[PDB]
Symmetry: C2
Subunit: 101 residues, 2 copies
């Protein structure tokens, strides 16, 4: 899991119900609907390679053989970059083993 | 949608395939598997009320009547806070209308 959390299922509450929430240290507090709780549980397992790109072009090597998706996105940024992707052939690689015991 | 993005479905690629990615401005670049692309599409619609809590206790009022979930979490923080939640009754409220035309 990407980080630890505590989940209170508060069930059905009427608009205007006030939650009084106590905490021992700086942490995030998020009140959400059931649909959004389902989204949250998905994002606990969300993994990817990359991050903020400040130079161009960049190269990223695919780590394992499988179906891959590349996202360019403006999360935390003012706008969406124009982008292009060129798929370069893998270098030949040997598969390693352990040393003979 | 929480932010704009561009999605390249690169299909099946062998380990070691190198993606050369060009961008016009600072943006995020994320290479991910199909399962993780499904998670990503969920997080484009992820909405909640709250944020980083620096005082305690805090109060959050439920905005609409429905099934609610409260998350306390350590995303971006060193550790998970101890927490408690007390559910306080809603204040009586009138429903407003428009002024008579």
């Amino acid at each position: 899991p990407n980080f630890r959390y505590t989940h209170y299922d508060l069930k059905e509450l009427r608009a205007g119900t006030t939650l009084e929430i106590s905490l021992s240290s700086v942490n995030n507090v998020r009140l959400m609907t059931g649909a959004n709780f389902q989204r949250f549980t998905e994002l606990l397992d969300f993994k990817y390679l990359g991050g903020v790109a400040k130079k161009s072009p960049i190269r990223i090597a695919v780590p394992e053989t499988m179906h891959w998706h590349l996202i360019i996105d403006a999360e935390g940024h003012s706008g969406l970059a124009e982008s292009s992707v060129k798929m370069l052939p893998a270098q030949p690689q040997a598969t390693l083993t352990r040393k003979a015991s």
